């Protein structure tokens, strides 16, 4: 118990100094009206706050369904083949069997979905993690739509595939963080909303919107408007002190850290100690070596 | 107020005799403490003290609470049960407001409490305006001398992260040491102003 | 500092929370100093509530001069802000 008391009495001062140092380093970093994060000298610290330009208050964890699905399951859940598949019209008020233009739209949809899955699995989350904080709780909005409109799973829907594609594309076009007709403004807008677009396309696939959710035109329009409004509410406001907010958000948990790990390691990181207590390497071997003890 | 086991608290409310829970003998507690204080703190000595004090108040023999003795909670429980009470110190209590018998049985008994030198009236302080330091012309320090409260670095940081520029301007300028000077537009130094 | 044209404006078309706080505070302060009220009063006595009800009807006669990091600025009416 004496050790515990001593640790408290020392850790308090350690973390107080750490937090003062942190705040002094980032007090001047603020979000500007052009979306960039800059310090008092105008030097750009980030080109978009958090790399997506969203307030950390408004984000919630969402699951990427397409990430962990196999190729077979991904096809089953997202591939629509009107030539071979006829169950789609069983879920619809309008027959679309053996329709050419609708099949072309579905093929473009599935090509974009496969591209998104490739980008997720190879570039973004190669470790296969699916739960990540994004703007707007889209699953909750879908549940709200199911409850509000009393969606009967047995009632065929009046939604056409083209309605779904056009609505989702227009929604994605209305998630504006950066404004401007230039080329790099378009690039940064696309990058900022890329992950959200991937989630939206995986959630609102035509096969899901029809066979899984049984949405109708009114419910789908309400979902689109609600998602657009919620996203526009998550955008970080210009003039927010993101630097001091980050300093406080890192410092506050330090006051409960364990006094290498804990406050000592944080102190080593923050001062950029040229000599640290426990230098180490994490050498990863080749796949055939790493799978055998003898070669290791 | 505090027990002899690190259990310190302040009075949050006072109830009169009629409004407090009572036993079937009409015992009303002097103090009611929250159960949640016990588990995390693991002050089992507080509970053993309450049970032993109940036994000693009933029997008149003084209670030996010396450490490292063979006084077990089982023996104290047997002594308490010998007086016609629930061995573990629980009692059926009734609600003062409705007279209804509480669903839970209460741990009720005598415990030694201490009045601490920290009284709220010794501490309550409010300043609107008053004395200032001669040199800095800011609110003086101290409750006793009618002084202001320190708006420190951490509070300034909190108001910065909030984004309340006018709050900072008011707290640090309009409410502490507002002053006016005349500067020369040529050399930028404070001028002679009448 | 060069004023940006109304058509060229690139900042958000929504009122920021900081902008809303500043606008309400400034209008309430002006009302407390006997500025004419541009909304019908139903017996309100707090200038802040009067400014809030003016805002709900977009009747606050104020602009926001949003400054870009280079010094160019855009003037947004409290009425046109969303």
């Amino acid at each position: 118990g004496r050790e515990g008391l001593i640790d408290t009495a020392v850790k308090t001062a350690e973390t107080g100094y750490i937090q003062r140092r942190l705040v002094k380093a980032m007090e001047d970093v603020m979000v500007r009206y052009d979306g960039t994060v800059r310090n008092a000298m105008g030097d750009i610290i980030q080109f978009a706050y958090g790399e997506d330009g969203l307030d950390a208050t408004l984000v919630e964890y969402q699951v990427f369904d397409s990430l962990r699905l196999s190729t077979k399951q991904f096809e089953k859940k997202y591939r629509i083949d009107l030539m071979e598949d006829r169950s789609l019209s069983l879920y619809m008020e309008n027959s679309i069997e053996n329709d050419s233009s609708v099949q072309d739209l579905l093929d473009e949809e599935y090509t974009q979905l496969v591209a998104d899955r490739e980008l997720l699995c190879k570039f973004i989350f190669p470790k296969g993690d699916a739960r990540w904080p994004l703007p707007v709780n889209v699953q909750r909005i879908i549940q709200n739509a199911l409850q509000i409109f009393h969606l009967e799973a047995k009632k065929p829907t009046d939604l056409l595939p083209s309605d779904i594609i056009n609505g989702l594309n227009e929604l994605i076009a209305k998630l504006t963080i950066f404004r401007g007709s230039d080329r790099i403004t378009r690039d940064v807008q696309n990058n900022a909303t890329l992950l959200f677009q991937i989630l939206l396309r995986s959630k609102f696939a035509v096969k899901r919107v029809i066979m899984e959710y049984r949405l109708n035109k009114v419910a789908f329009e309400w979902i689109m408007g609600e998602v657009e409004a919620r996203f526009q509410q998550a955008v970080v406001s210009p003039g927010e002190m993101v630097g001091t907010l980050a300093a406080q958000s890192i410092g506050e948990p330090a006051t409960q850290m364990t006094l290498t790990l804990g406050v000592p390691r944080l102190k080593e990181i923050l001062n950029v100690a040229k000599n640290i207590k426990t230098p180490s390497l994490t050498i990863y071997l080749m796949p055939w070596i790493a799978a055998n003890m003898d070669l290791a | 107020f505090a027990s002899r086991h690190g259990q310190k608290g302040t009075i949050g409310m006072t109830y009169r005799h009629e409004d407090m829970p009572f036993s079937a003998q009409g015992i009303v507690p002097d103090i009611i403490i929250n159960p949640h204080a016990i588990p995390s703190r693991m002050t089992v000595a507080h509970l053993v003290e309450c049970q032993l004090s109940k036994v000693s108040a009933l029997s008149g023999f003084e209670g030996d609470a010396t450490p490292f003795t063979d006084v077990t909670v089982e023996a104290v429980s047997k002594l308490l049960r010998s007086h016609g009470f629930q061995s573990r110190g629980f009692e059926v209590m009734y609600h003062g407001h409705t007279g209804r018998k509480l669903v839970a049985q209460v741990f009720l008994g005598p415990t030694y409490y201490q009045r601490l030198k920290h009284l709220v009236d010794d501490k309550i302080h409010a300043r609107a305006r008053g004395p200032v330091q001669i040199l800095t012309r800011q609110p003086v320090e101290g409750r006793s001398r009618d002084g202001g409260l320190r708006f420190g670095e951490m509070e300034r940081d909190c108001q910065i992260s909030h984004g309340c520029s006018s709050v900072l301007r008011e707290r640090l300028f309009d409410c502490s040491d507002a002053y006016r000077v005349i500067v020369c537009d040529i050399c930028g130094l404070i001028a002679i102003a009448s | 500092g060069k004023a940006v044209a109304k058509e060229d404006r690139t900042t958000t078309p929504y009122m920021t929370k900081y902008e809303r706080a500043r606008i309400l505070g400034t209008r309430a302060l002006q009302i407390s100093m006997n500025a004419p009220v541009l909304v019908d009063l139903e017996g309100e006595t707090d200038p802040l509530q009067i400014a809030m009800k003016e805002l709900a009807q977009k009747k606050i006669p104020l602009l926001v001069r949003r400054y870009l990091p280079d010094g160019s600025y855009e003037d947004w009416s409290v009425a046109e802000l969303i």
């Binding site: 009206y33 | - | 900081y18 006669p61 602009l63 400054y67 409290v78």
Partner: peptide, 15 residues
């Protein structure tokens, strides 16, 4: 809250 400046719009004060 001070990352911008407030001005009067006289066009509105006329109307």
């Amino acid at each position: 809250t001070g990352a911008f400046d407030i001005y009067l719009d006289q066009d509105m004060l006329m109307n």
